[PDB]
Amino acid sequence: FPAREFQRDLLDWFARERRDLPWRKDRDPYKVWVSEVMLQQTRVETVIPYFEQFIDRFPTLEALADADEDEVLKAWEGLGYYSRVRNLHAAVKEVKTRYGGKVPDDPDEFSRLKGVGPYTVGAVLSLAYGVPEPAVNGNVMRVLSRLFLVTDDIAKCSTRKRFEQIVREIMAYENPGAFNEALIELGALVCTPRRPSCLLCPVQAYCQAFAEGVAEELPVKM
DNA sequence: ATCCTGTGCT
DNA sequence: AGCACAGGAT
Numbered sequence: 406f407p408a409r410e411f412q413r414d415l416l417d418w419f420a421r422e423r424r425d426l427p428w429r430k431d432r433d434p435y436k437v438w439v440s441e442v443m444l445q446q447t448r449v450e451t452v453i454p455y456f457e458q459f460i461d462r463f464p465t466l467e468a469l470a471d472a473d474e475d476e477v478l479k480a481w482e483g484l485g486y487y488s489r490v491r492n493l494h495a496a497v498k499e500v501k502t503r504y505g506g507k508v509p510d511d512p513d514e515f516s517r518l519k520g521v522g523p524y525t526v527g528a529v530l531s532l533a534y535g536v537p538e539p540a541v542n543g544n545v546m547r548v549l550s551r552l553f554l555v556t557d558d559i560a561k562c563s564t565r566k567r568f569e570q571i572v573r574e575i576m577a578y579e580n581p582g583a584f585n586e587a588l589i590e591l592g593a594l595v596c597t598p599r600r601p602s603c604l605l606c607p608v609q610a611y612c613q614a615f616a617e618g619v620a621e622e623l624p625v626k627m
Numbered sequence: 628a629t630c631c632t633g634t635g636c637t
Numbered sequence: 638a639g640c641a642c643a644g645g646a647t
């Protein structure tokens with residue numbers, strides 16, 4: 406696989422098209438983390454004002470850690486999935502109490518926190534700390550399944566481990582955050598669930614699904 | 628190594 | 638009423 410050329414085309418596209426979303430204002434692991442939790446459950450159009458309101462109320466990890474659960478829930482109200490904010494709240498309290506108030510940059514340690522799974526670990530650590538971990542969410546699974554014609558069920562850990570291995574092989578190690586962000590952004594804007602915009606895709610020349618005319622059949626979910 | 632869960636959609 | 642979605646699940 407011509408990974409360097411792929412990285413060039415993907416990252417050049419990302420340089421031009423990257424959305425100036427609120428959670429991209431800085432690289433605070435706390436803020437990235439909050440935005441990833443919101444985006445896991447809610448459309449970007451709705452997350453935008455909730456994120457700003459949430460971070461206004463709780464600007465830093467310690468601010469959230471120290472807030473009463475009532476205040477946290479009030480800030481979440483309208484987003485639903487309240488157990489997921491309760492878990493975030495417990496996790497940042499644990500960060501304050503056992504991890505010096507700093508999000509661990511060890512994927513293993515960060516993963517032990519309540520609610521924190523492989524994707525959240527990869528997103529937060531690569532975006533905020535530049536740790537070369539894969540950040541494979543639904544968007545990335547769709548992009549990789551198409552590029553590499555992966556027809557395995559994406560609900561399976563074996564399939565996700567394969568996607569993880571692909572990212573580790575093709576990642577731009579000089580900027581893992583940008584690389585991971587770019588794959589997610591491509592999935593959001595171009596390589597969409599239905600009718601992907603293949604004709605204006607920056608990595609079309611690399612894509613096996615486009616070449617075979619089966620992009621809309623991918624990814625495979627049982 | 629999942630399959631479960633809250634949610635939205637039709 | 639039943640299905641799709643989307644990640645973490647121990």
Ligand code: SF4
Nearest residue numbers: 551596603606612620
């Ligand atoms: S060419 Fe189409 S299917 Fe392939 S990655 Fe680009 S948008 Fe996705």
Ligand SMILES: [Ca+2]
Nearest residue numbers: 516517521522
């Ligand atoms: Ca975990």
